[PDB]
Design a protein around this ligand. Structure first.
Ligand code: D1R
Length: 215
C-alpha cells in the first residue's frame, strides 16, 4: 500500500450529508460506498438515494437501524442491482418520518453486481482502499459523540453501532490515521469528517468492512 490516499482528491466522494433524526447511518454508509465505486469504475460522480434504502429495503428497519451487508443484498437480489439517484428519490426521513416505498420509473444512477467482505486486517483494508475506492465500515460511535477534531487515539472499542465511509488514510503522520466521512452534516467534526488512529483497531473499525462490486 502507498503511504497516503485520500479519495476526496480523486473525485470519488460527494459532499457531506445529514441523516437527521433517523437511524439510517447504515444507508449512508452503503450509498457512499456505491457512489465511490461507481466513480472509480470510470463513470461521473453522482449522488445516489439513501431514501430508496430507508423506505424500500425490507431486510433492514429504516430509521430503526440496519446493516450494510443486508442493504447490498437487497439491492442486488431484490432491486436487480439498481440504485436510484438522489434527485429521483430524495431524502425526506431527516425528521424521523418513514414514508412507504414509492418505486416506479425512477432514474437509475448506478448498478452493482455483488458485494464483498474484507479481511479484519488494517493493512489489507488500506491496500484494498488504495486500489479500489471508499469502503463501508462499522464502528463503535461512543467516542464520536464528543468529537470536535484532531486525531482520535482512545476510541471506545466495545460494540459496533454505526456505519460510516472510509475515504483515505495517511501513514506519514505521527500518529498515522484513517479519514472517515460521517453522515451528521458538515457542522460535525472536521467539516463532517473524523480522523482516527490507524494500526490500533480504533473503534473496532476493522471488524465489518465491505464494498459493492461494480462490473
Ligand atoms: C446509525 C448510528 S447513529 O448515527 O449513531 C444513530 C442514529 C440514531 C440514534 C442512535 C445512533 C444506526 C442507529 C440505530 C438506532 C436507531 C434508534 C435508536 C438507537 C439506534 N445504527 C445502525 O443501524 C447499526 C449499524 C451497524 C452496521 C454494521 C454493523 C453494526 C451496526 N445497526 C444496528 O445497530 N443493528 C443492525 C440491525 N438490527 C436488527 C439491530 C442492530
Amino acid at each position: 500500500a502507498p503511504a497516503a490516499v485520500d479519495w476526496r482528491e480523486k473525485g470519488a466522494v460527494t459532499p457531506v450529508k445529514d441523516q437527521g433524526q433517523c437511524g439510517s447511518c447504515w444507508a449512508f454508509s452503503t450509498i457512499g460506498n456505491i457512489e465511490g465505486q461507481w466513480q472509480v469504475a470510470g463513470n461521473p460522480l453522482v449522488s445516489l438515494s439513501e431514501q430508496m434504502l430507508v423506505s424500500c429495503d425490507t431486510i433492514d428497519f429504516g430509521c430503526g437501524g440496519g446493516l450494510m451487508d443486508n442493504a447490498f443484498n437487497w439491492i442486488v437480489n431484490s432491486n436487480g442491482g439498481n440504485v436510484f439517484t438522489e434527485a429521483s428519490y430524495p431524502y425526506v426521513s431527516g425528521n424521523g418520518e418513514q414514508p412507504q416505498c414509492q418505486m416506479n420509473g425512477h432514474e437509475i444512477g448506478a448498478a452493482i453486481t455483488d458485494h464483498v467482505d474484507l479481511p479484519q486486517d488494517e493493512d489489507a483494508i488500506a491496500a484494498y482502499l488504495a486500489e479500489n475506492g471508499p469502503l463501508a465500515i462499522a464502528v463503535d460511535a461512543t467516542s464520536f459523540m464528543d468529537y470536535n477534531g484532531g486525531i482520535l487515539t482512545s476510541c471506545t472499542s466495545e460494540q459496533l453501532d454505526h456505519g460510516v465511509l472510509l475515504v483515505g488514510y495517511n501513514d506519514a503522520s505521527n500518529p498515522p490515521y484513517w479519514i472517515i466521512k460521517n453522515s451528521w452534516s458538515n457542522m460535525w467534526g472536521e467539516d463532517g469528517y473524523i480522523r482516527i488512529e490507524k494500526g490500533t483497531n480504533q473503534c473496532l473499525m476493522n471488524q465489518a468492512v465491505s464494498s459493492a462490486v461494480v462490473g
